Amino acid sequence: MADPETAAKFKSKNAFPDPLNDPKCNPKSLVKKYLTPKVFESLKNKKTKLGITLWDCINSGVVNLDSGVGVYAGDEESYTLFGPLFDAIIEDYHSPYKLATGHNSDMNPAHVKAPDLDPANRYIRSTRIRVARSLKGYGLAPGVTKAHRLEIEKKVVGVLTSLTGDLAGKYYPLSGMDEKTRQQLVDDHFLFKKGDRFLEAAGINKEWPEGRGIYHNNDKTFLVWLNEEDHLRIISMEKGSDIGSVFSRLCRAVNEIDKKLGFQHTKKHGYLTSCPSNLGTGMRASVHVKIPHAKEHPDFENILTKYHIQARGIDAGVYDISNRRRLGLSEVQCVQDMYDGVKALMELEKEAIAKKRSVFPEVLKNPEVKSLLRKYLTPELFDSLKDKKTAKGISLYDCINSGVENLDSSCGVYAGDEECYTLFAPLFDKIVEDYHSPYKLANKHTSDMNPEKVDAPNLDPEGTYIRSTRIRVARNVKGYALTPGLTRNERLDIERKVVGVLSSLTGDLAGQYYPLTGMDEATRQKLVNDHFLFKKGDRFLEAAGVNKLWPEGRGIFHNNDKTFLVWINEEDQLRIISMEKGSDIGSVFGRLCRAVNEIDKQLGFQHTDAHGYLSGCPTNLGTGMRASVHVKIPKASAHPDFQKICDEFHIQARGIGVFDISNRRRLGLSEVQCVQDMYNGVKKLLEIEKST
Ligand SMILES: NC(=[NH2+])NCCC[C@H](N)C(=O)O
Ligand SMILES: NC(=[NH2+])NCCC[C@H](N)C(=O)O
Ligand SMILES: NC(=[NH2+])NCCC[C@H](N)C(=O)O
């Protein structure tokens, strides 16, 4: 509801803005509240050295009557010259701050004591810190000249492009930006466009888009908007909870710019901004956190009040926590209040969950729940294990959570790390030996990725019966938790290490990596069509803690021949797939071993004598293998020796007359033995399909 036509009538006469007395005007409007006829008369003929008038400052609030604030400062002098208006607006908006009290700035990140709150990402989803700043020697955004805006861009870009380490990146000016770059910044949510009706009426859109630009570091955890609403809008942000690191990164960039260029800053106002709402710290610090139980707690609102923070919607139970204050507290204090506030809120969520988890899951008492979880989790077993935690902080309840939340689970138990299989052995042993029957853990498991130990002459080089051959192995990188118990930095380290290895793959294994984070739709559809794409895990994986921080750290690798595929950090940290059209099981497995053995040599896999290769899902232990053969068999299908064969070789057929022959077992036999069995069995199914 912008009416610049009406406002211009009064502005060109330098007369009092009668629209402020329109009943349509926001009752809460600070310009309406404090621009009285006497204030107008007293200041209407005054100008700053940059020629800024009272009408220039109040115009947006007159054009846009729904304005909450409704004034912008054209320059520093505006804050003093039109003081009778600005002081009143500032001390209202920033109550209880008084200009007489003075403001204290502090951008030393060492003053902040913020041990990482939630590395495991159990509650906090993301952290963000923004500051607004303006350079010394120029007007503010509504008043800055055409040449000065350009000079500001030149000076800022000079500093930003000299940034090293995690702050290193690239500047993208808006002027002359091409279509592809524009689109990329849109996908990253880094792009800004021409100012809205509030900025327009403030004169901020002058010379658009000249002098405007966007800078971001390579990690995309640092962003600068140049010459938008203020000279600088500087943002440090990332997934997870590490606000101390976020703030430190922010300070290192801001202090350098300060060092080289200098900011507009006063004792009374702190850092000067176009909108008086952004004075003082110029800061908006925020955290996304899931605290559905904290909201109902009687101390919830007292915590927010105590730390001068606020909680709003953004995802169920997820709140955007942010600061309320900018004047009267330093930037360090804002961050510290934020840390302490979020910490207090999280602890409330933790208490409620702990209490709920202190007792046997009542829902497991329904005798119609037929999960292996229900079968083996006796109340006695529960009480005996409920108070133990792995070195990585995994509880029994973390392990059984998915089977509790999803009662229709077949199994319902996941391991958060290797230690779970031992620390919670009384549960896991029973589940492993049930699902992987007849395997016993005392038997132990033998891995074997030597493809030469497989004797597999090509069964059908024609292509008559066997349409395709596929062999997958699930693996997890040694030195880390399992998927459900991964911290943010572990997952990122795994992606980095794995991609590093995969990029060095030469020959027929050479390919490229496609991360899910920042994937454009074209690349996506390309992958979908090759059946290479995976998506967020279902409710079972969600409840197990697998989907944390999706899609960060997830990605896809394939070779140029479309015969080798790697999924990174999906259900397991590594899903490695070898595949060919035709029947050459031997070739497929040989390619698989070459890739897996090399990754093994460089990184190492999680593995035990008793469980073979470790996975967060107990069903994927041992070989962690699925060997698959798309075949056409009705003759042998109907043959009375079908059973004897499919049972002698531990294989199984399902239809998708195309059938899917896959292996039954994963523990108690090596990868070599599993492949040989598949060959030996599919062979016999062909030595009937072929007969006459
Ligand atoms: N981006 C901002 N400066 N927002 C605060 C002021 C917004 C608008 N001028 C108003 O008075 O409601
Ligand atoms: N804490 C976060 N992850 N914030 C991201 C959201 C950014 C968005 N501009 C906002 O409304 O704040
Ligand atoms: N047999 C394996 N694939 N082991 C993977 C890990 C590397 C090494 N054998 C270790 O246990 O530390």
XYZ file of C-alpha atoms and ligand atoms in Angstrom:
728
model
C 0.000 0.000 0.000
C 2.562 2.582 -1.122
C 1.229 6.028 -2.072
C 4.192 8.130 -3.279
C 1.874 10.320 -5.387
C 0.145 11.766 -2.303
C 3.402 12.138 -0.358
C 5.037 14.064 -3.219
C 2.262 16.682 -3.042
C 3.242 17.531 0.523
C 6.990 17.072 0.002
C 7.206 19.531 -2.912
C 5.507 22.119 -0.684
C 7.748 21.216 2.256
C 4.495 20.945 4.220
C 3.434 18.670 7.093
C 2.602 15.121 5.968
C -1.175 14.962 6.458
C -1.208 11.245 5.464
C 0.289 10.544 8.920
C -3.149 11.491 10.264
C -4.878 9.087 7.857
C -6.645 6.376 9.917
C -5.015 3.846 7.560
C -1.651 4.754 9.084
C -0.007 2.217 11.389
C -0.934 3.280 14.953
C 2.469 1.946 16.032
C 4.348 4.077 13.468
C 7.257 5.862 15.164
C 7.314 8.657 12.567
C 3.593 9.279 13.116
C 4.135 9.142 16.879
C 7.028 11.616 17.000
C 6.747 13.882 13.952
C 4.433 16.494 15.455
C 3.558 19.762 13.642
C 5.947 21.564 16.017
C 8.813 19.162 15.280
C 8.132 19.588 11.557
C 8.055 23.400 11.708
C 11.252 23.468 13.785
C 13.260 21.289 11.369
C 11.595 21.654 7.941
C 14.045 24.324 6.726
C 17.237 22.657 7.978
C 19.721 20.830 5.732
C 22.865 18.768 6.325
C 26.113 19.390 4.427
C 24.997 16.645 2.033
C 21.722 18.526 1.578
C 19.614 15.988 3.477
C 16.243 17.435 4.542
C 13.751 16.372 7.210
C 11.415 15.408 4.375
C 14.119 13.160 2.901
C 14.358 11.289 6.197
C 10.622 10.870 6.851
C 9.510 10.206 3.260
C 9.363 6.400 3.364
C 7.104 6.515 6.424
C 4.725 8.860 4.599
C 4.688 6.934 1.310
C 4.376 3.661 3.219
C 1.868 4.390 6.000
C 2.088 0.806 7.286
C 5.682 1.576 8.336
C 6.712 0.557 11.847
C 9.615 3.002 12.014
C 9.288 5.184 8.921
C 12.511 7.196 8.896
C 15.935 6.749 7.308
C 19.052 8.826 7.945
C 20.710 10.269 4.845
C 23.935 10.786 6.792
C 25.498 10.934 10.255
C 24.602 14.618 10.603
C 20.927 13.725 10.094
C 20.949 11.959 13.469
C 21.920 15.200 15.227
C 20.424 17.893 12.983
C 17.041 16.165 13.096
C 17.794 14.898 16.602
C 14.479 16.035 18.139
C 12.858 13.446 15.834
C 15.521 10.704 15.765
C 16.312 10.700 19.504
C 12.648 10.100 20.325
C 12.326 7.346 17.692
C 15.569 5.675 18.848
C 14.731 5.709 22.568
C 11.280 4.303 21.810
C 12.409 1.507 19.476
C 15.423 0.609 21.610
C 13.797 1.102 25.028
C 15.028 0.993 27.674
C 18.248 2.324 26.076
C 19.093 5.980 26.705
C 21.356 7.988 24.395
C 22.751 9.687 27.509
C 23.965 6.324 28.830
C 26.211 5.770 25.807
C 26.980 2.615 23.810
C 29.903 0.185 24.034
C 31.095 -1.827 21.025
C 33.195 -4.991 21.239
C 34.217 -7.123 18.270
C 36.829 -9.258 20.029
C 35.683 -12.891 19.606
C 38.008 -14.026 22.424
C 35.731 -12.212 24.882
C 33.074 -14.812 24.022
C 33.075 -18.110 25.926
C 31.094 -20.468 23.700
C 32.026 -24.167 23.781
C 30.116 -25.853 20.928
C 26.632 -26.597 22.313
C 25.367 -29.314 19.979
C 28.071 -30.982 17.811
C 25.812 -34.036 17.444
C 23.031 -31.787 16.134
C 20.379 -33.233 18.458
C 18.584 -29.895 18.787
C 20.251 -27.000 16.949
C 19.978 -26.884 13.151
C 21.734 -23.662 12.146
C 23.451 -20.504 13.412
C 23.624 -17.029 11.846
C 25.169 -13.671 12.743
C 24.616 -10.509 10.700
C 25.958 -6.978 11.191
C 25.254 -3.736 9.313
C 28.118 -1.253 8.848
C 28.906 1.975 6.978
C 32.315 3.382 5.976
C 33.795 6.649 7.289
C 33.762 9.699 5.032
C 30.557 9.109 3.085
C 26.827 9.678 3.370
C 24.613 6.794 4.427
C 22.749 4.768 1.774
C 19.868 7.239 1.309
C 22.355 10.102 0.917
C 25.511 8.611 -0.611
C 26.510 10.202 -3.931
C 26.907 8.279 -7.190
C 30.710 8.553 -7.168
C 30.938 7.738 -3.452
C 28.854 4.560 -3.802
C 31.308 3.515 -6.528
C 34.296 4.414 -4.340
C 32.766 2.422 -1.478
C 32.448 -0.618 -3.746
C 36.051 -0.249 -4.946
C 37.466 0.065 -1.409
C 35.386 -2.773 0.058
C 36.113 -5.191 -2.811
C 39.812 -4.385 -2.432
C 39.695 -5.578 1.176
C 37.369 -8.548 0.580
C 39.400 -9.969 -2.329
C 42.524 -9.864 -0.144
C 40.889 -12.114 2.475
C 42.667 -15.447 3.060
C 41.864 -18.809 4.640
C 38.199 -19.679 5.172
C 37.283 -16.095 4.222
C 38.703 -16.435 0.704
C 36.095 -16.165 -2.043
C 34.869 -14.056 -4.953
C 33.045 -10.758 -5.499
C 30.087 -10.624 -7.900
C 29.005 -7.084 -8.818
C 25.308 -6.676 -9.672
C 26.120 -4.389 -12.605
C 26.972 -6.529 -15.626
C 26.007 -9.772 -13.890
C 25.129 -12.468 -16.428
C 22.126 -14.827 -16.300
C 23.928 -17.952 -15.071
C 25.675 -16.136 -12.209
C 22.382 -14.500 -11.215
C 20.662 -17.904 -11.157
C 23.465 -19.479 -9.100
C 23.245 -16.781 -6.424
C 19.454 -17.247 -6.420
C 19.858 -20.975 -5.714
C 22.320 -20.173 -2.917
C 19.892 -17.573 -1.521
C 22.664 -14.957 -1.775
C 21.055 -12.651 -4.328
C 19.328 -9.381 -3.524
C 17.248 -7.334 -5.973
C 16.090 -3.721 -6.330
C 14.938 -2.315 -2.992
C 11.279 -2.668 -2.016
C 8.807 0.217 -1.599
C 10.382 1.185 1.732
C 13.884 1.459 0.254
C 12.496 3.119 -2.887
C 10.790 5.875 -0.901
C 13.953 6.324 1.173
C 15.948 7.207 -1.945
C 18.105 4.128 -1.377
C 17.471 2.711 -4.879
C 19.282 5.644 -6.550
C 21.523 4.637 -9.477
C 20.357 1.004 -9.228
C 22.153 -1.374 -9.578
C 25.428 0.553 -9.849
C 27.897 -0.025 -7.009
C 25.895 -2.954 -5.627
C 27.508 -6.369 -5.251
C 27.710 -9.718 -3.481
C 30.731 -11.448 -1.941
C 30.860 -14.947 -0.467
C 33.657 -17.218 0.730
C 34.234 -20.567 -1.002
C 32.653 -22.457 1.908
C 29.563 -20.246 1.571
C 29.598 -19.633 5.319
C 30.306 -15.926 4.847
C 28.300 -13.416 2.801
C 28.547 -9.677 2.137
C 25.889 -7.495 0.521
C 27.508 -4.330 -0.775
C 25.549 -1.059 -0.936
C 22.054 -2.463 -0.356
C 20.272 -0.834 2.618
C 23.618 0.066 4.174
C 27.121 0.178 2.691
C 27.758 -3.255 4.171
C 25.560 -6.103 5.331
C 27.979 -8.733 6.601
C 26.793 -12.249 7.441
C 28.542 -15.269 8.949
C 26.395 -18.404 9.023
C 26.481 -22.198 8.945
C 24.500 -25.324 9.827
C 24.938 -26.734 13.314
C 25.519 -24.954 16.600
C 29.039 -23.500 16.682
C 28.176 -19.830 17.318
C 31.650 -19.129 18.733
C 33.244 -20.139 15.440
C 30.618 -18.230 13.428
C 31.274 -15.043 15.407
C 35.055 -15.432 15.226
C 34.901 -15.718 11.437
C 32.641 -12.659 11.323
C 34.948 -10.598 13.544
C 38.067 -11.464 11.545
C 36.456 -10.101 8.378
C 34.786 -7.058 9.977
C 37.869 -6.011 11.978
C 40.011 -6.117 8.827
C 37.569 -3.893 6.938
C 37.478 -1.635 10.010
C 41.286 -1.592 10.152
C 41.674 -0.672 6.481
C 38.683 1.626 5.948
C 37.011 2.635 9.226
C 33.315 2.676 10.164
C 30.845 5.446 10.985
C 30.495 5.126 14.748
C 29.545 7.316 17.708
C 29.527 6.889 21.483
C 25.809 7.611 21.583
C 24.593 5.587 18.596
C 27.246 2.903 18.226
C 27.587 2.018 14.540
C 25.534 4.317 12.292
C 22.986 2.795 9.891
C 20.343 4.008 7.423
C 17.535 2.706 9.627
C 17.668 3.688 13.321
C 16.513 0.118 14.084
C 20.005 -1.108 13.155
C 22.050 1.268 15.336
C 24.441 0.155 18.086
C 25.654 -3.351 17.271
C 23.906 -3.395 13.905
C 23.528 -7.056 14.801
C 21.001 -9.818 14.303
C 22.273 -13.030 15.902
C 20.078 -16.099 15.394
C 19.791 -19.859 15.919
C 17.327 -22.421 14.573
C 16.631 -24.976 17.300
C 14.025 -27.703 17.772
C 12.640 -27.344 21.295
C 8.977 -28.478 21.245
C 8.989 -29.432 24.943
C 10.660 -26.213 26.121
C 7.760 -24.062 24.875
C 5.333 -25.576 27.394
C 7.767 -25.230 30.306
C 6.872 -22.474 32.829
C 10.417 -21.056 32.752
C 10.449 -20.719 28.943
C 9.411 -17.055 28.797
C 11.606 -16.072 31.757
C 14.648 -17.402 29.895
C 13.806 -15.293 26.827
C 13.167 -12.233 29.003
C 16.372 -12.764 31.001
C 18.590 -12.871 27.919
C 16.655 -10.245 25.942
C 16.024 -12.746 23.152
C 12.905 -13.824 21.254
C 11.527 -17.080 19.847
C 9.481 -17.279 16.638
C 8.450 -19.750 13.944
C 10.742 -20.387 10.970
C 10.185 -27.756 11.031
C 7.795 -29.005 13.725
C 8.884 -27.556 17.062
C 11.653 -25.567 15.368
C 12.121 -21.985 16.556
C 14.168 -19.097 15.209
C 15.758 -17.610 18.321
C 17.106 -14.063 17.902
C 18.231 -11.008 19.870
C 15.865 -8.151 20.722
C 18.482 -5.514 21.562
C 21.200 -3.600 19.673
C 21.898 -0.496 21.773
C 23.286 -0.720 25.313
C 24.972 -4.092 24.882
C 28.139 -4.939 22.951
C 28.372 -7.377 20.043
C 30.227 -9.790 22.334
C 27.459 -9.501 24.933
C 24.763 -10.087 22.305
C 26.466 -13.324 21.232
C 27.066 -14.395 24.836
C 23.425 -13.761 25.788
C 22.426 -15.743 22.705
C 24.702 -18.662 23.619
C 23.516 -18.712 27.234
C 19.867 -18.286 26.250
C 19.907 -21.102 23.690
C 21.831 -23.266 26.184
C 19.115 -22.718 28.797
C 16.320 -23.474 26.314
C 18.070 -26.626 25.089
C 18.552 -27.906 28.651
C 14.792 -27.612 29.166
C 14.236 -29.723 26.045
C 16.858 -32.195 27.296
C 15.180 -32.604 30.707
C 11.798 -33.368 29.135
C 13.335 -35.954 26.780
C 15.399 -37.502 29.604
C 12.304 -37.891 31.799
C 10.358 -39.427 28.903
C 13.269 -41.797 28.213
C 13.752 -42.683 31.886
C 11.019 -45.324 31.636
C 10.368 -48.452 29.531
C 8.671 -47.442 26.258
C 5.034 -48.248 27.123
C 4.171 -48.499 23.423
C 6.335 -51.636 23.258
C 3.825 -53.464 25.474
C 1.239 -53.886 22.702
C 1.599 -57.577 21.734
C 0.750 -56.655 18.124
C 4.101 -54.874 17.804
C 6.187 -57.594 16.152
C 9.508 -55.768 15.782
C 12.743 -57.530 16.762
C 13.118 -54.583 19.132
C 9.953 -55.582 20.995
C 10.882 -59.270 20.839
C 14.237 -58.839 22.585
C 13.893 -55.638 24.632
C 12.595 -56.995 27.935
C 11.971 -54.479 30.748
C 14.788 -56.181 32.681
C 17.159 -55.677 29.737
C 15.976 -52.067 29.467
C 16.694 -51.184 33.103
C 20.115 -52.861 32.914
C 21.229 -50.840 29.866
C 19.254 -47.566 30.020
C 21.942 -45.594 31.870
C 24.997 -46.409 29.759
C 26.377 -44.180 27.006
C 29.136 -44.760 24.461
C 32.229 -42.539 24.376
C 30.407 -40.604 21.628
C 27.340 -40.145 23.839
C 25.051 -42.760 22.272
C 22.381 -44.213 24.584
C 20.319 -47.398 24.302
C 17.324 -45.151 23.670
C 19.116 -43.453 20.762
C 19.578 -46.937 19.311
C 15.977 -48.087 19.725
C 14.371 -44.693 19.012
C 13.249 -45.549 15.457
C 11.582 -48.775 16.620
C 9.765 -46.793 19.298
C 8.658 -43.998 16.965
C 7.888 -46.442 14.165
C 6.112 -49.420 15.746
C 5.697 -51.089 12.351
C 9.477 -51.512 12.222
C 10.777 -54.937 11.217
C 13.868 -54.424 13.360
C 13.754 -50.971 14.929
C 17.317 -50.745 16.237
C 20.251 -48.763 14.835
C 23.843 -48.418 16.040
C 25.166 -44.886 16.570
C 28.777 -46.068 16.670
C 30.936 -49.206 16.858
C 30.809 -49.228 20.667
C 27.026 -49.744 20.521
C 27.494 -53.308 19.261
C 29.463 -54.076 22.433
C 28.006 -51.726 25.058
C 24.492 -52.790 24.078
C 25.470 -56.358 23.120
C 22.647 -57.941 25.166
C 20.257 -56.316 22.670
C 22.357 -56.203 19.494
C 23.663 -59.789 19.681
C 20.108 -61.139 19.834
C 18.961 -58.918 16.971
C 21.971 -59.734 14.774
C 21.666 -63.484 15.321
C 17.914 -63.338 14.697
C 17.958 -61.389 11.428
C 21.165 -63.031 10.184
C 20.165 -66.557 11.274
C 21.734 -69.092 11.286
C 24.912 -67.021 11.882
C 26.342 -67.020 15.409
C 28.724 -64.277 16.561
C 31.071 -66.887 18.033
C 31.575 -68.150 14.463
C 33.062 -64.778 13.517
C 33.167 -63.383 9.987
C 35.725 -63.473 7.170
C 35.968 -60.648 4.645
C 37.508 -61.289 1.227
C 37.733 -58.737 -1.571
C 40.096 -60.683 -3.833
C 38.182 -61.009 -7.142
C 40.667 -63.619 -8.426
C 39.250 -66.114 -5.907
C 35.985 -66.004 -7.878
C 35.830 -68.443 -10.816
C 33.133 -66.954 -13.052
C 33.323 -67.605 -16.813
C 30.703 -65.361 -18.488
C 27.363 -67.194 -18.311
C 25.554 -65.475 -21.189
C 27.794 -63.107 -23.222
C 24.932 -62.893 -25.725
C 22.491 -60.958 -23.551
C 19.621 -63.405 -23.987
C 18.652 -64.093 -20.372
C 20.690 -61.857 -18.065
C 19.680 -58.244 -18.741
C 21.990 -56.768 -16.097
C 24.355 -57.475 -13.194
C 24.778 -55.374 -10.043
C 26.907 -55.665 -6.904
C 26.648 -53.179 -4.030
C 28.643 -52.957 -0.809
C 27.874 -50.711 2.149
C 30.924 -49.417 4.024
C 31.699 -46.949 6.780
C 34.940 -44.981 7.166
C 37.216 -46.013 10.044
C 37.834 -43.473 12.813
C 34.292 -42.107 12.958
C 30.885 -42.752 14.476
C 28.321 -44.614 12.400
C 25.762 -42.643 10.368
C 23.132 -42.165 13.117
C 25.733 -40.826 15.571
C 27.738 -38.592 13.235
C 28.534 -35.049 14.350
C 28.428 -32.220 11.795
C 32.213 -32.067 11.431
C 32.615 -35.849 11.119
C 30.170 -35.977 8.204
C 31.961 -33.072 6.485
C 35.359 -34.708 7.086
C 34.068 -37.984 5.612
C 32.779 -36.261 2.459
C 36.088 -34.408 2.045
C 38.227 -37.524 2.550
C 36.078 -39.758 0.336
C 35.825 -37.242 -2.533
C 39.593 -36.800 -2.244
C 40.084 -40.525 -2.818
C 37.444 -40.807 -5.565
C 38.948 -37.865 -7.475
C 42.269 -39.730 -7.670
C 40.623 -42.779 -9.248
C 42.178 -43.332 -12.694
C 41.262 -45.557 -15.636
C 37.698 -46.848 -15.921
C 37.011 -45.654 -12.364
C 37.655 -42.008 -13.252
C 34.622 -39.756 -12.811
C 33.303 -36.677 -11.025
C 31.522 -35.775 -7.794
C 28.045 -34.249 -7.556
C 27.226 -32.914 -4.066
C 23.551 -32.614 -3.117
C 24.255 -29.235 -1.499
C 23.901 -26.567 -4.177
C 22.814 -29.006 -6.885
C 21.024 -27.247 -9.760
C 17.875 -28.831 -11.244
C 19.536 -29.719 -14.566
C 22.274 -31.764 -12.863
C 19.574 -33.288 -10.655
C 17.360 -34.392 -13.543
C 20.485 -35.731 -15.273
C 21.147 -37.939 -12.250
C 17.472 -38.949 -11.873
C 17.440 -40.194 -15.468
C 20.546 -42.341 -14.909
C 18.913 -43.596 -11.687
C 21.873 -42.208 -9.721
C 20.007 -39.848 -7.398
C 19.080 -40.568 -3.799
C 16.921 -38.468 -1.488
C 16.317 -37.830 2.218
C 15.779 -40.971 4.299
C 12.303 -42.157 5.293
C 10.685 -41.957 8.755
C 12.751 -44.920 9.997
C 16.039 -43.218 9.121
C 14.691 -39.876 10.367
C 13.893 -41.372 13.764
C 17.310 -43.066 13.833
C 19.042 -39.708 13.384
C 20.319 -40.433 9.878
C 18.796 -37.369 8.164
C 20.624 -34.789 10.329
C 21.498 -31.542 8.511
C 20.254 -32.797 5.120
C 21.730 -32.549 2.535
C 25.044 -31.301 3.958
C 27.879 -33.763 3.370
C 25.820 -35.867 0.959
C 26.921 -36.393 -2.623
C 27.143 -38.684 -5.628
C 30.096 -39.971 -7.656
C 30.030 -42.002 -10.864
C 32.527 -42.956 -13.557
C 32.170 -41.848 -17.188
C 31.056 -45.345 -18.272
C 28.049 -45.416 -15.888
C 29.301 -48.718 -14.478
C 30.443 -47.453 -11.086
C 28.406 -45.447 -8.569
C 29.132 -44.092 -5.092
C 26.626 -42.512 -2.723
C 28.225 -40.530 0.089
C 26.613 -40.181 3.530
C 23.176 -41.447 2.547
C 22.149 -44.407 4.751
C 25.759 -45.449 5.271
C 28.815 -43.239 4.776
C 29.679 -45.209 1.652
C 27.416 -47.104 -0.694
C 29.591 -48.524 -3.443
C 27.957 -49.997 -6.544
C 29.394 -51.779 -9.581
C 27.067 -52.537 -12.473
C 27.038 -53.614 -16.121
C 24.539 -54.542 -18.781
C 24.848 -58.242 -19.491
C 25.967 -61.174 -17.376
C 29.634 -60.655 -16.477
C 29.391 -60.988 -12.677
C 33.153 -61.563 -12.628
C 33.877 -58.251 -14.362
C 31.462 -56.317 -12.145
C 33.014 -57.733 -8.964
C 36.549 -57.192 -10.256
C 35.755 -53.516 -10.816
C 34.129 -53.297 -7.379
C 37.145 -54.768 -5.583
C 39.563 -52.464 -7.398
C 37.584 -49.435 -6.214
C 36.784 -50.684 -2.698
C 40.310 -51.957 -1.985
C 41.797 -48.602 -3.006
C 39.378 -46.630 -0.823
C 40.163 -49.148 1.919
C 43.928 -48.611 1.582
C 43.556 -44.822 1.724
C 40.879 -44.441 4.412
C 40.164 -47.700 6.240
C 36.750 -49.185 7.052
C 34.904 -49.874 10.312
C 35.155 -53.614 10.888
C 35.153 -56.351 13.553
C 35.878 -60.088 13.525
C 32.372 -60.809 14.837
C 30.313 -58.374 12.729
C 32.467 -57.963 9.630
C 31.968 -54.492 8.166
C 30.051 -52.250 10.567
C 26.910 -50.344 9.576
C 24.398 -48.221 11.468
C 21.863 -50.773 10.264
C 22.466 -54.295 11.684
C 20.913 -55.744 8.507
C 23.919 -54.414 6.566
C 26.673 -56.126 8.581
C 29.235 -58.698 7.421
C 29.704 -58.229 3.684
C 27.273 -55.322 3.634
C 26.700 -56.677 0.147
C 23.793 -57.028 -2.238
C 24.739 -58.966 -5.373
C 21.999 -58.716 -8.007
C 21.157 -60.273 -11.386
C 18.235 -59.212 -13.620
C 17.340 -62.459 -15.396
C 14.499 -64.034 -17.416
C 13.505 -67.446 -16.039
C 10.137 -69.241 -16.311
C 11.409 -72.754 -17.199
C 13.780 -73.136 -14.244
C 11.313 -71.057 -12.187
C 8.703 -73.790 -12.557
C 11.319 -76.582 -12.367
C 11.088 -78.692 -9.158
C 14.825 -78.115 -8.606
C 14.201 -74.375 -8.176
C 13.910 -74.723 -4.395
C 16.965 -76.977 -4.031
C 19.058 -74.526 -6.080
C 17.867 -71.202 -4.626
C 18.339 -72.768 -1.182
C 21.737 -74.398 -1.786
C 23.081 -71.040 -2.936
C 21.239 -68.790 -0.469
C 19.700 -66.696 -3.232
C 16.221 -65.269 -3.770
C 14.122 -64.281 -6.781
C 11.547 -61.499 -7.033
C 9.847 -60.018 -10.103
C 10.097 -56.478 -11.474
C 9.083 -62.129 -17.006
C 12.109 -60.345 -15.574
C 13.322 -61.542 -12.183
C 15.714 -60.244 -9.531
C 18.126 -62.855 -8.182
C 19.802 -61.532 -5.023
C 21.779 -62.975 -2.104
C 20.042 -63.933 1.148
C 22.999 -63.739 3.538
C 25.545 -61.117 4.595
C 27.162 -62.652 7.692
C 29.030 -65.959 7.774
C 30.253 -65.812 4.178
C 32.851 -63.660 2.425
C 32.186 -61.248 -0.432
C 33.993 -63.762 -2.663
C 31.817 -66.665 -1.497
C 28.653 -64.594 -1.956
C 29.582 -63.751 -5.551
C 30.597 -67.332 -6.380
C 27.316 -68.645 -4.949
C 25.306 -66.185 -7.043
C 27.249 -67.300 -10.110
C 26.960 -71.001 -9.246
C 23.202 -70.645 -8.725
C 22.219 -68.370 -11.623
C 24.268 -70.798 -13.719
C 21.990 -73.724 -12.842
C 18.878 -71.615 -13.470
C 20.343 -71.089 -16.951
C 21.270 -74.773 -17.387
C 17.499 -75.342 -17.402
C 16.328 -72.215 -19.237
C 18.717 -73.266 -22.013
C 17.824 -76.973 -22.181
C 15.414 -78.465 -24.721
N 15.189 -3.452 7.098
C 14.802 -2.551 7.992
N 15.553 -1.481 8.210
N 13.666 -2.719 8.663
C 13.154 -1.790 9.670
C 12.340 -0.650 9.060
C 11.330 -1.167 8.042
C 10.359 -0.106 7.513
N 11.083 1.072 7.040
C 9.328 0.242 8.581
O 9.291 1.359 9.103
O 8.500 -0.596 8.941
N 19.454 -19.225 11.927
C 19.341 -19.372 10.613
N 19.733 -20.497 10.042
N 18.834 -18.398 9.866
C 18.672 -18.482 8.416
C 17.473 -17.691 7.923
C 17.890 -16.374 7.288
C 16.729 -15.427 6.973
N 17.201 -14.285 6.200
C 16.062 -14.963 8.266
O 14.862 -14.684 8.302
O 16.707 -14.848 9.308
N 39.742 -55.389 6.230
C 39.435 -54.109 6.079
N 38.776 -53.713 5.003
N 39.791 -53.224 7.003
C 39.496 -51.799 6.920
C 40.275 -50.973 7.918
C 41.753 -50.942 7.601
C 42.585 -51.826 8.524
N 42.493 -53.224 8.122
C 42.132 -51.617 9.965
O 41.379 -52.416 10.519
O 42.500 -50.638 10.612
